[model samples]
Target: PLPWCPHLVAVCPIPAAGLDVTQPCGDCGTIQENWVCLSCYQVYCGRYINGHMLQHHGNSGHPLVLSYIDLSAWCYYCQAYVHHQALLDVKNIAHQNKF
Candidate 1:
């Protein structure tokens, strides 16, 4: 069954392999082949980029964005991207009055 919540936001399936997006961290611009999703407590590799957001990282509860040595990533329990200022502008807004 789907979750029932008064607040509905844009949420996507977590890609389990998303952490594998070996490209340099967008935030720090560092070449890191392995990315970790704090919510899932798993290390992702370069091949699992999409899987990271669509399969794993469920706790993240939203689109999978990368974190870096400096900036924070999303928080699963809160369903909020931590310290992601760009996302902040849109995170809390309700869409279908239920998404």
Candidate 2:
């Protein structure tokens, strides 16, 4: 298990249920690799596409996100990548879809 940021974990305890990689970005409706907001389960395109994830963290003050494509967790509070077993489980499920 990866050592995770407690603050991040406290803020984002679980990944969104039934995430779809093919889902369109919430902000622009473009289908792309998206980041899932652990705080609210909102999905948005990455920094490459209008930076909706960063905008969401800035707006909601919820600083953790899980990548729909890679199952990687990133923390705005830590300003770096972080991980936890729960996130891995989400990834495992996503990986099974082979997206």
Candidate 3:
């Protein structure tokens, strides 16, 4: 993992479904990629699920999100996937998970 996020201490409530896509959107209970908050390990819906991931980033400025569907890491501040080795690490994890 990367450096710990300072903002994660606030502790948002984890969705009942957890990281698993039991429904889809942990917040809206819709369908799409389940995002894991690197900041707090809290899981929520992705853009497909009413953009709850974006909402979380907008709300918390937590900076990084790991996608449960593919183990991809997104940087909120960078507005993209992390660079270089971190990007490769993300892809490696995703591949290992076979998602």
Mind giving the per-residue lDDT tens digits that candidate 1 earns over 1-99? 123222233323344443333344333444544444433334443333434433344544443333433233444445664443343322332121113
Say which candidate scores most in TM-score: 2
Evaluation by TM-score, superior candidate among 1 and 2: 2
Decide which is better by lDDT, 1 or 2: 2
Model number with the top lDDT: 2
Per-residue alpha-carbon lDDT of candidate 2 for residues 1-99, written as tens digits (9 for 90 to 100): 337776555444444456566667788887777887777878888998788888888888887787877777888788778766656666666677555
For residues 1-99, could you state the per-residue lDDT of candidate 3 as single tens digits?
Answer: 334333333334444433443335557765456777766665678775578888887887777777766566777765556534434543454455554
Clashes of 1: 19
Q: What is the RMSD of candidate 2?
A: 2.8
- Alpha-carbon lDDT, every model: 0.38, 0.73, 0.60
List where candidate 1 sits over 4 angstroms from the true fold.
1-34, 45-49, 59-66, 83-99
